[PDB]
């Protein structure tokens, strides 16, 4: 028997609760590559 805990609330970055940390990491990696593919196709010298 020990004392009760309190209802220690969520913190500042509580908003990213729906996703795993590793999921967010995949998103940013996806985020960059989509841009540079568009940077490949656009500005390709369409002569």
């Amino acid at each position: 028997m020990i004392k009760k805990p309190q209802k220690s609330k969520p913190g500042v970055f509580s908003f990213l609760d729906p996703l795993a940390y590793e999921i967010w990491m995949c998103i940013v990696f996806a985020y960059i590559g989509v841009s540079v593919v568009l940077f490949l196709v656009s500005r390709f010298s369409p002569y």
Binding site: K3, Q6, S8, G11, V12
Partner: protein, 49 residues
Amino acid sequence: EGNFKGLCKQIDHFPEDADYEADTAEYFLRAVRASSIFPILSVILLFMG
């Protein structure tokens, strides 16, 4: 509105049970709280301006 009206207490943070020091986000939030740090600084640049 009491048996002595206009008796002005000074108040700070108080140590309750186990204090949640591991909540350093909270203890820092306590540390910012008992201070006018931003409302005093809101005077400062307004004075400096």
